[PDB]
Amino acid sequence: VVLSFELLHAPATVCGPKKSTNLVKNKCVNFNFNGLTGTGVLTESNKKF
Amino acid sequence: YVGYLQPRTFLLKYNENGTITDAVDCALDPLSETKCTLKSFTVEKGIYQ
Ligand SMILES: *[C@@H]1O[C@H](CO)[C@@H](O)[C@H](O)[C@H]1NC(C)=O
């Protein structure tokens, strides 16, 4: 059985079993948003999505 | 109306709200090619390779 993975950036829709931790903002936290891993600080965004 | 797409490089302009308001087709004519090379919609007087 050959499992072919396609690793795109935005649309994941397939993630392994992991616990959804509560949101923490306004401090340096290593987030992981559908694989998007990076150290940063969370802030309210006012841009038109 | 029915048209056909082709592989073409484009220069897209994003506004403050992230909506495409203008675009340049690089292969349309030499002026658009110069705009693509300079990565700007405004080109000053001069000679550009
Ligand atoms: C962006 O959206 C805001 C929302 O009110 C608007 O005032 C502004 O004119 C928009 N800018 C555009 C569409 O370039």
State the strand order across the main sheet of chain A: 1-2
- Report how far the terminal alpha carbons of chain A are from each other: 41 Å
Work out the strand percent of chain A: 15-25%
- Structural class label of chain A: mainly beta
Task: List the bound ligands.
Answer: 2-acetamido-2-deoxy-beta-D-glucopyranose
Percent helix among the residues of chain A? under 10%
What's the SSE pattern of chain A?
Answer: EE
Main β-sheet description of chain A: 2 strands, antiparallel
Oligomer: part of a larger assembly
User: What would the principal axes of the Cα set say about the shape of chain A?
Assistant: elongated
Number of helices of chain A: 0
Rg of Cα set of chain A: 14 Å
How many β-strand stretches of chain A? Answer: 2
Protein name (chain B): Spike protein S1
Disulfide bonds (chain B): 26-36
Region (Putative superantigen) (chain B): 15-36
Glycosylation sites (chain B): 17
Question: Characteristics of this structure?
Answer:
about 0% helix; Spike protein S1 (chain A); part of a larger assembly; 2 chains; mainly beta
Structural account:
This is part of a larger assembly, with 2 copies of chain A (49 residues). By secondary structure, the first copy, chain A, is mainly β. The first copy, chain A, contains no helices and 2 strands. In chain A, strands 1-2 form a two-stranded antiparallel sheet. In chain A, strand 1 (28-33) and strand 2 (36-41) form a beta hairpin. Chain A is elongated, with a radius of gyration of 14 Å. The chains hardly touch. The structure holds 2-acetamido-2-deoxy-beta-D-glucopyranose. 2-acetamido-2-deoxy-beta-D-glucopyranose binds next to loops of chain B. The PDB classes it as viral protein.
